[PDB]
Amino acid sequence: AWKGEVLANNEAGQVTSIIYNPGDVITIVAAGWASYGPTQKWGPQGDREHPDQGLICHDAFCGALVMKIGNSGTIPVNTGLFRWVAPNNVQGAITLIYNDVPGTYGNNSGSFSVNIGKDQS
Amino acid sequence: AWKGEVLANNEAGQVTSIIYNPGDVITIVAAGWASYGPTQKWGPQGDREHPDQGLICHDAFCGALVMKIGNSGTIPVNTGLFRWVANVQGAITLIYNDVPGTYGNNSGSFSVNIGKDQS
Ligand SMILES: CO[C@@H]1O[C@H](CO)[C@H](O)[C@H](O)[C@H]1O[C@H]1O[C@H](CO)[C@H](O)[C@H](O)[C@H]1O
Ligand SMILES: OC[C@H]1O[C@H](O)[C@H](O)[C@@H](O)[C@H]1O
Ligand SMILES: [Ca+2]
Ligand SMILES: [Ca+2]
């Protein structure tokens, strides 16, 4: 049961209190409005119209919510995950990150409100 | 225990297998790209720039996911609901947030998962 925020302009991400363990089943709901530069704002799925220019997650759009579990590569979160189990050999603290190009977070604004819970297993 | 899709052009909503009962704790997660007219698509939170011209849900943007429970007013769903508790009682119908009579030109759909949680 973690609840908190993820700033668009935070390159390092938001480390949550959720340690993902082998067999854990998780739910995530992400909401909100944030920008990677422009005056317009996008939701947790990001901007489907914008080209990939070196995103930390190539499998999500610019401005999408992504995560790392432990020492994993980025995993798309987008609007959330429903009763979700990680690939085998993936474990450790969940960090939530705004999908942008490394070095380009200065002009980002807004944030995502995210809830994460462990489910019956 | 319910998984499927909600079409933008379905005025009448998607009637799900979830009957909401007093005290029930539920989770919805909605995903995908849909439209209420334009060639451009929006997500489950809808179009934050477009004004309200008599949307079925005044509490959400045009093109947002909403729902009804039984005979109730529209309730915002947006990207989903996390361990949400609702006198609201009955079958959960999911609906695209648009204006009555004008669904004909909508396109796309949202993916939606609903479950009941521990309580
Ligand atoms: C659409 O924003 C900017 O477009 C120009 C073209 O005129 C360039 O392609 C820039 O790279 C774009 O900058 C924005 O996007 C990148 C991510 O791709 C980054 O977030 C930057 O901070 C933004 O301004
Ligand atoms: O505001 C709602 C309204 O917006 C646009 O004009 C659409 O083309 C219409 O079909 C209707 O959905
Ligand atoms: Ca940026
Ligand atoms: Ca329409």
Side-chain angles (χ1 to χ4, degrees):
Chain A
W2 181 88
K3 161 78 197 84
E5 299 292 321
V6 194
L7 286 189
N9 76 7
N10 179 18
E11 191 167 317
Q14 181 54 34
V15 181
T16 87
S17 59
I18 307 292
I19 302 77
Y20 185 92
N21 313 300
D24 276 348
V25 175
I26 67 172
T27 292
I28 305 179
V29 176
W33 298 105
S35 193
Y36 57 88
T39 40
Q40 299 83 33
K41 263 168 252 196
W42 298 268
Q45 294 173 149
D47 189 345
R48 63 189 216 112
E49 295 297 299
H50 193 79
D52 189 332
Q53 304 197 303
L55 299 165
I56 59 161
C57 190
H58 299 296
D59 294 323
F61 299 130
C62 182
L65 181 67
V66 307
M67 74 189 313
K68 283 162 167 178
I69 307 169
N71 279 243
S72 73
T74 47
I75 301 153
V77 177
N78 295 306
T79 65
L81 298 162
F82 185 87
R83 292 173 188 183
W84 182 90
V85 182
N88 277 0
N89 311 121
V90 171
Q91 60 173 64
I94 297 160
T95 302
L96 302 169
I97 323 149
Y98 193 67
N99 206 18
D100 207 344
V101 171
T104 66
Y105 278 74
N107 67 345
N108 302 7
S109 77
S111 64
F112 298 137
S113 181
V114 197
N115 288 252
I116 306 171
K118 293 179 180 202
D119 296 334
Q120 150 184 339
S121 145
Chain B
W2 194 85
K3 189 199 179 186
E5 308 81 31
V6 190
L7 310 194
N9 71 344
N10 191 6
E11 187 274 342
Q14 191 62 300
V15 201
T16 79
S17 65
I18 309 293
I19 309 315
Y20 188 94
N21 305 305
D24 271 0
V25 187
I26 71 160
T27 291
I28 312 187
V29 174
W33 303 102
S35 194
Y36 59 89
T39 303
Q40 167 170 33
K41 310 263 232 325
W42 296 266
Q45 290 187 151
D47 183 4
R48 69 186 284 266
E49 287 180 1
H50 193 75
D52 187 355
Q53 294 150 3
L55 296 163
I56 63 156
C57 194
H58 302 316
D59 276 313
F61 296 126
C62 179
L65 189 57
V66 299
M67 83 194 311
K68 292 174 167 178
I69 295 170
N71 62 21
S72 72
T74 45
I75 299 162
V77 180
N78 300 308
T79 58
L81 305 156
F82 176 95
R83 293 164 193 191
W84 183 87
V85 57
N87 282 261
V88 182
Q89 173 176 11
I92 300 183
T93 299
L94 306 161
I95 325 135
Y96 196 59
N97 195 26
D98 204 0
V99 178
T102 83
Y103 280 75
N105 67 347
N106 301 358
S107 58
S109 59
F110 300 134
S111 268
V112 186
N113 282 272
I114 322 190
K116 288 170 193 223
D117 306 324
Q118 313 205 327
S119 60

